[PDB]
């Protein structure tokens, strides 16, 4: 009952996003709501529509990838203990990103293809890999019907929680062989790591993998925008706070 509640709360995740438009293109500064569990490019059509008056996104002059869940980007671009109740009055939590245009594409990020097919294909192939990690093969996801594969992604676009849960569970590993975990530092020196954590014969706690987390370089473990106790079980953590792309993301913050 609680895993469902937890997942619903994650699906409801939503952020105030300030989209600063590059003069080169209140139309200069868009204010939109974007869920944590989705990609920024899924909202490009909404951004273009508003400004009927290459390109990529940037945070504080640094190009940002689009292939990470918005919530994950937020965790590493916005640098918690403070409850809403004890929070100073009227603190505005938001993400400011810039839509810029240029002659040459920034070298470190996958370019935005603006084809409406790019995001879905990437995301689906990635779940195929997450399935490989969890089960040892992509059988479960490849066994989905064509209708189901399309509806799986459709749920991300329309926010259909029921469909996303039905399909993500179908393909989700009874007991993972390994945990699909990604550890990263703040993007404001950036380090990212995908450690190999086996579940065979063990039941690791966050503290148990302290070695891996620390290899990425006094630090607070943030997952889904919240602090996680070092004694929580990895599997539990993954099964509950993994993002809409199948990966569990941990962000290290001071």
């Amino acid at each position: 009952a609680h895993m469902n509640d937890i997942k619903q709360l994650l699906w409801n995740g939503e952020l105030n996003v300030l989209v600063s438009i590059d003069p080169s293109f209140e139309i200069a500064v868009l204010r939109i709501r974007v869920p944590r569990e989705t990609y920024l490019v899924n909202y490009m059509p909404l951004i273009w529509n508003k400004i009927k008056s290459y390109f990529w996104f940037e945070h504080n002059k640094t190009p940002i990838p689009w292939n990470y869940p918005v919530g994950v980007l937020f965790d590493c671009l916005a640098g918690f203990t403070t409850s809403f109740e004890n929070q100073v009055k009227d603190v505005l939590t938001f993400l400011r990103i810039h839509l810029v245009m240029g002659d040459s594409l920034p070298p470190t990020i996958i370019p935005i293809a603006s084809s409406k097919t790019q995001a879905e294909k990437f995301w689906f192939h990635q779940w195929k890999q997450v399935c490989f990690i969890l089960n040892g093969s992509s059988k479960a996801i490849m066994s989905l019907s064509v209708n189901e594969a399309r509806k799986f992604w459709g749920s991300v676009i329309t926010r259909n929680f029921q469909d996303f849960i039905e399909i993500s569970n179908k393909i989700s590993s009874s007991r993972p062989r390994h945990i699909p975990l990604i550890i990263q530092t703040s993007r404001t020196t950036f380090r990212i790591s995908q450690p190999t954590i086996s579940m065979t014969g063990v039941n690791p706690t966050l503290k148990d993998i302290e070695g891996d987390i620390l290899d990425v370089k006094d630090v607070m473990v943030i997952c889904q925008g919240i602090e996680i106790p070092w004694h929580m079980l990895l599997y539990d953590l993954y099964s509950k706070l993994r993002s809409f792309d199948g990966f569990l993301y941990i962000t290290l913050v001071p």
């Binding site: 509640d5 709360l9 952020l15 105030n16 603190v91 505005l92 919240i226 106790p229 509950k240």
Partner: peptide, 24 residues
């Protein structure tokens, strides 16, 4: 309960992130 802790923290997160959403 660990889940009660997560439920509580996620609700708070969503509340903080939703504050002043009328400006967006």
């Amino acid at each position: 309960s660990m889940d009660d802790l997560l439920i509580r923290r996620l609700t708070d997160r969503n509340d903080k992130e939703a504050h002043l959403n009328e400006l967006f």
